Amino acid sequence: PFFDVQKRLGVDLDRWMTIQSAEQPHKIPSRCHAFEKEWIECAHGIGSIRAEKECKIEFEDFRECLLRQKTMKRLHAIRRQREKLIKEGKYTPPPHHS
C-alpha cells in the first residue's frame, strides 16, 4: 500500500483476500495451494529483485499449475501422435479407452 495504515493499526481490511493460500471458509484449499505456498515462502523477505532470480523454479511451477500451458502441450503431442498412428493403422486403442 502507498500508506500502510493496515499494518500500523494491525487491522486486516483486504489482506484476507489477496492470495489463494490464505485461510478459506471451511478450509477449502485452492487447486494450486501447495505451489503458491512454496513460492511465497521462497520469496519471503528477500525482495522482488532477488526473488525474480532465486525463486524462479518455484514461480515456474506455480505458473504451470495456474495455466497448465506445458501440461496441455504434452497432452496435445500425445493426442496428435496417437491420431497419426490410428490413421495409418499402426496402433489400436485398448479395451479400456473405449
Partner: protein
C-alpha cells in the same frame, strides 16, 4: 524434469467393497465405530504424506477392515440389515429419519449378537489421536532450501556526516 513414479497395476489390486451407497449409509454409524483404528491410520497417512502413493498399504487395510465388518453383518444380522438399507434406498435423499423403525430393529440385532453400540450424536466428528509407526515425514512438500535473508542492519543510529550533503547545503 524427472519421471513420475507410479505403482504397478498389480500393486493397486484389492478386493473392493461392492455395495451400494444406501448400504454404506445404513451401516455408516456402526462402521465408523468398529473400523475407526485402520481408518484413522489411513487418514493420518494421507494428510501427513500428501501423496496417495505413500499410503497404499494403509489403504488396503481400510478395505480389509470394511470387508470383515460386512461379513459380520452377513453372518448374524443380514435380514434386519437388509430391511433397513432397503428403506434408506427408497428415499431420494436417503434420509435416516424416514426409517427409525427399521433402524431400531437393526441396532437391536447387532447389539445382541455382536455387542455393537451405535455411537452417540457428535462422536464420529471428534478429532482423535492414533498410534502409528510410520515416521513423521520430514519434507512432505519436497521444498528446496530457502534463500538466505539479506544481512541485518544493526548498530546505533548516528547523525548524518556533514548533514544532507545536498549540493551546497551545510546541514
Amino acid at each position: 524434469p524427472g519421471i513420475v513414479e507410479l505403482p504397478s497395476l498389480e500393486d493397486l489390486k484389492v478386493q473392493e467393497v461392492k455395495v451400494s451407497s444406501s448400504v454404506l449409509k445404513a451401516a455408516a454409524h456402526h462402521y465408523g465405530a468398529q473400523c475407526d483404528k485402520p481408518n484413522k491410520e489411513f487418514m493420518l497417512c494421507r494428510w501427513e504424506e500428501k501423496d496417495p502413493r505413500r499410503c497404499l498399504e494403509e489403504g488396503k487395510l481400510v478395505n480389509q477392515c470394511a470387508l470383515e465388518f460386512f461379513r459380520q453383518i452377513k453372518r448374524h444380522c443380514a435380514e434386519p440389515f437388509t430391511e433397513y438399507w432397503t428403506c434408506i434406498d427408497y428415499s431420494g435423499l436417503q434420509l435416516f429419519r424416514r426409517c427409525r423403525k427399521q433402524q431400531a430393529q437393526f441396532d437391536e440385532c447387532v447389539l445382541d449378537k455382536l455387542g455393537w453400540v451405535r455411537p452417540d450424536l457428535g462422536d464420529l466428528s471428534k478429532v482423535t489421536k492414533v498410534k502409528t509407526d510410520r515416521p513423521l515425514p520430514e519434507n512432505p512438500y519436497h521444498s528446496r532450501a530457502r534463500p538466505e535473508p539479506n544481512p541485518e542492519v544493526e548498530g546505533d543510529l548516528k547523525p548524518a556526516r556533514h548533514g544532507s550533503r545536498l549540493f551546497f547545503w551545510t546541514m
